[PDB]
C-alpha cells in the first residue's frame, strides 16, 4: 500500500522532466551521478516495448525485486573497489542523491503551488503560500 508511494518517489527521481516515462538519457544521468559508466536496462523492464519505462512497468520490476541487491548497492558505493565504503564515498553518493531528491521535491512544491514553471507570484500570493 504505502510502498507504491515510495516507489513513485524512486520513479520520479529518474523521471526528471516529469512526462511519466524514464528515457535512456534520464536513466544515464543518475547512473553517472552514482559513479557508474544501458539500452538493455531499459528493455529489461519495458513490457509494452516502446523503448521507455512508464511507472506501471517500474512498479512490476521493483515489486518483483521484493540479499544480492544490497551487494550490488555496496559495489556502486565502493567507488575504488577496495572492499570498503569510506566516509568520502558514502558522503559523495548520498550528497549527490540527496541533492537530486531535494530538486525533485522543489519542483513538486512549485507545481503544487500553481506556479508550474514560467509562472510568478506577487507579494500577496507569496505571503499566503509562505505562511499557514
Amino acid at each position: 500500500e504505502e510502498q507504491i508511494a515510495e516507489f513513485k518517489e524512486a520513479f520520479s527521481l529518474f523521471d526528471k522532466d516529469g512526462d511519466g516515462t524514464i528515457t535512456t538519457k534520464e536513466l544515464g544521468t543518475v547512473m553517472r551521478s552514482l559513479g557508474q559508466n544501458l539500452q538493455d536496462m531499459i528493455n529489461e523492464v519495458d513490457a509494452d516495448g516502446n523503448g521507455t519505462i512508464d511507472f506501471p512497468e517500474f512498479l512490476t520490476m521493483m515489486a518483483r525485486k521484493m540479499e544480492e541487491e544490497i551487494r550490488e548497492a555496496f559495489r556502486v558505493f565502493d567507488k575504488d573497489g577496495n572492499g570498503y565504503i569510506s566516509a568520502a564515498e558514502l558522503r559523495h553518493v548520498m550528497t549527490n542523491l540527496g541533492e537530486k531528491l531535494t530538486d525533485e521535491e522543489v519542483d513538486e512544491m512549485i507545481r503544487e503551488a500553481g506556479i508550474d514553471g514560467d509562472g510568478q507570484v506577487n507579494y500577496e500570493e507569496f505571503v499566503q503560500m509562505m505562511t499557514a
Partner: peptide, 23 residues
C-alpha cells in the same frame, strides 16, 4: 541482478533518508 540492483541502490539510499527523517 545488477540491473534491478542498480535501480534498488537509489531506492535504498532514498529509504535511508526517509528512515533518518523519522528521527
Amino acid at each position: 541482478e545488477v540491473t534491478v540492483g542498480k535501480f534498488y541502490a537509489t531506492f535504498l539510499i532514498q529509504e535511508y533518508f526517509r528512515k533518518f527523517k523519522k528521527r
